[model samples]
Target: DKRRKTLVIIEKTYSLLLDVEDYERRYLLSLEEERPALMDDRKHKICSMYDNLRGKRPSDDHFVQIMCIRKGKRMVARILPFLSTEQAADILMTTARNLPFLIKKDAQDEVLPCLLSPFSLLLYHLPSVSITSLLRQLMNLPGSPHLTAVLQNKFGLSLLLILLSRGEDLQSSDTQNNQWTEVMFMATRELLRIPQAALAKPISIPTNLVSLFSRYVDRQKLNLLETKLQLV
Candidate 1:
């Protein structure tokens, strides 16, 4: 009976821990709001936030949710390797999905990639949901040349092939059926237009791309179609 009561208390304590830690985290963010950029003292306070997120498992749905905030992303972006691959993937996906919101909400787009190798690696094997989110954010930006090049250099086209492969080596769905499909084609188009001719090379697009771009060639084709673009 004592053990049973102790277990119940443990469960309840665990439940309350999330709320308590969240409050403490927000309290630190309030101080951050007053301060300018991330200072040493702010970094010290974020140490606790790091510990809170690091120990959490997927079962703690709230843990991932907590780390979605602006400050939380800054922390993770700084100490990305401290998080496991799964946690880091979740972070990258969440941030990319909310890029539009984060820009307007916190103006921290520059810091989103404080440590980008990790973010790029995460994109290498994104879920379909993440795929959709990434493209949607890029679409919202209209023409993001920097984002496109960064993505392309860091396994962007490779992952695109994997997704487009769709179980078969050279199969993909219609761009009309998927908005991200059109967005990817357009975004990649913008990347190829820049003076970076070295990146532009001959490669066969997926047959589906062939279908979509019958009138137009594609990425290089798409790039030729639009004016130069930039992203902060």
Candidate 2:
């Protein structure tokens, strides 16, 4: 009964959202309020429901597509301000992991969210991961966008580079640990392979940005030394 109830609610909300463009902006007051209760309460089951939705054709069963995807992205964007870094990261990674397989090109402005959902903080405390894994997971999502914005944004570019560096390290790592390299590589490299042009031409990194990333890398060296000095 509970499973059926969850499915019903899932379908109902999705059905409503399909009919409402920009539904997330218009509907969600906050992450805590806007997200599916099932996502927060029964993530495993919800994951299963989404997986099931992926199987049915959206053209054939339009409701499944709405509930399982479009609304999912909207909900993620709507609740951005409320999600803890980790929770938001998880949602981003999980959703992106499945999106490319299903997402299609959109002509309508604001037709769908092209949110870059990668959260880099999760990189710590894990073994080197594979691009294959990310590709396998991200097989359904769209490609990179807003190149200038990502490059100009220190935090964003840094994160992308970090993912790339980690990917390289993962290549030489033991098989069991590399989970994020290929897709990370593709985001930076494959994106470059795309042919696009504009006035805001891509800019090269300066010495200062390199230094900034160096700080991000050897982050603990200085802080730990300071802590040790204080303890001594």
Candidate 3:
């Protein structure tokens, strides 16, 4: 009965994601005619449902598992902003733990990005979460070596670069800038920790992700990162 209930919850959540996507499309097409109040109400309803679902452990795992899939990733991204910081942190940790197994699958190229995209979204939402804490969590997990290998690979570097480059375009307060700079520094240090043998293999961004990182990432920061890695 619990498994059956999980399936029903998954189906309902997917339906809600689809409905939200439809509303978004309509809002974009008819911005002047769209009702902001109605959009906010629907979003609030979805967030409340997500909050309730996360309160139960088994259901939360099932929900996160489905969200890791390719189709679910895109839909989940649209609603990520609605999640509370606690919920975001939980999902981020769970997804990071799952990354090693996901990469072992045959369609890793496709699946890895699906996992990473939402991971990035979670980080974007919770800028205050330390990279050290995330790394510590991953290191304590069972499949940590595989995750380290993932970081050594192209996908891992891309994620670090994205995190490092995020918010560079924004005009924020001095403290905000300091926070982002610290994040970038931590990310670069992570990049440097990858073994030389692994880093030797030419790392290039996945074709589709080029736009995502290139648009926001600062070339100067990247050059400085390279210099630090090279000096090590």
Candidate 4:
């Protein structure tokens, strides 16, 4: 009877030890989530840490580290008052790259995609490549009502003007801009399902843009927009 009691005591001790180890492990992990904000080494230390992990990890995991380094989303936003247009642009580029993958991979994952508005406001700060990448991802998805809604707002209008304003050179030094202009236009067409009422709006068609569209046609190609143009 004493041997059995001794064995039971050992089992309880082992189980308690395991539980204590797990508790400690979790506490350390939680501290990791808090460490960047708590640290006093200034932004360089955190930026270096982020760069080290970012280079090791795939794009999908990078943003999680970004959030942790920011001390979480609220902390990131709290610091936004200090963000320059250039800094906001770089951060937005990082965010836009990772987000689509995260959303598709985990339907149940909690992502703060509501942050799109802040990006829209800073859209001019973003490179054309960022805009194209974001639009292409959303447009290729089955359908993105969220994307459509944001595009329906002035964000879409703003991007439309940007695309149309690109220089006439697919082979230019800024070929990325040229390529993204075409890509963004195609994606825009897919996202913006304009109704017939849109046909009646007082639109000022630019003469140069009209010539650019005219270059795409053979007399043999009939188009819905041309039909609508007759009425407009």
RMSD of each: 15.7, 12.8, 7.4, 15.5
Sequence-dependent TM-score of model 2: 0.34
How would you encode candidate 2's per-residue C-alpha lDDT over 45-100 as one tens digit per residue?
33343333343323423322332444444543434334444444444445444332
Clashing pairs in 4: none
Better of 1 and 4 by lDDT: 1
**Cα error, candidate 4, residue 200 (Å):** 25
Ranking by lDDT: 3, 1, 4, 2
TM-score of each: 0.37, 0.34, 0.56, 0.37
List per-prediction Cα lDDT, in the order shown: 0.44, 0.38, 0.50, 0.41
| Model 3 residue 178 lDDT score | 54
Q: Which of the predicted structures, 2 or 4, would earn the higher lDDT when compared with the native?
A: 4
Local accuracy of candidate 1 as per-residue lDDT tens digits, 29-80: 7975575543444344333444455344444333344333444445555555
User: Total clashing residue pairs per candidate?
Assistant: 0, 17, 0, 0
Residue 23 lDDT in candidate 2: 39
lDDT, candidate 1, at 189: 60
The segments of candidate 2 whose C-alpha lies over 4 angstroms from its true place after superposition are 1-64, 67-71, 78-94, 101-127, 130-132, 139-189, 198-232
